[PDB]
Amino acid sequence: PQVISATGVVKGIDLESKKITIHHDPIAAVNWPEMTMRFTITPQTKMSEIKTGDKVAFNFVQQGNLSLLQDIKVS
Template sequence: MNRYTQTVAQLLAAAALSLSLPAMAQMTMDHSKMGMAQATTGTAPAPGLTDGEVRKIDKENGKITIKHGEIKHMDMPPMTMVFNAKDKAMLDKVQVGEKIQFIVIQDAGKMVVTDIQPGK
């Protein structure tokens, strides 16, 4: 490679890198969604109580379907979804249609309810 070709190749490599940096920065910002804040900031917000309504209980499999409000510490909008219960005995204390407050965490890639309290 002659000196001119080498300089052009270096300039093209630098230009390609500068164009990719904004995309890389955007990817980092996207990780702050859905409970991944700890991956970029080093600390995750503490889980708090979330309002919800029990839609279905599957005691045998330790699952509960909850129509819930915003889960702030996970930056999750309101929706209805199935959660795993940390302790199946929690499911004996609630009924379908009941308003509750609950705490959910992400554990080994699963959404796990760790506490259920009567709703307010």
């Protein structure tokens, strides 16, 4: 779209199911308060090495009921 930047903390990562759970700060761009959400990852998501408990900066777009990561790095 409509790429949306957020920050948060990694709560869980699963490269098998292709999900990363992030506790993120509010996102006024889409009227989300503080929440823990599953973000979808693809072979195309630009990744740095991130671990559970890491503080992260990330970009994502929305399409379907999926929130799809375009990249993610450690903050």
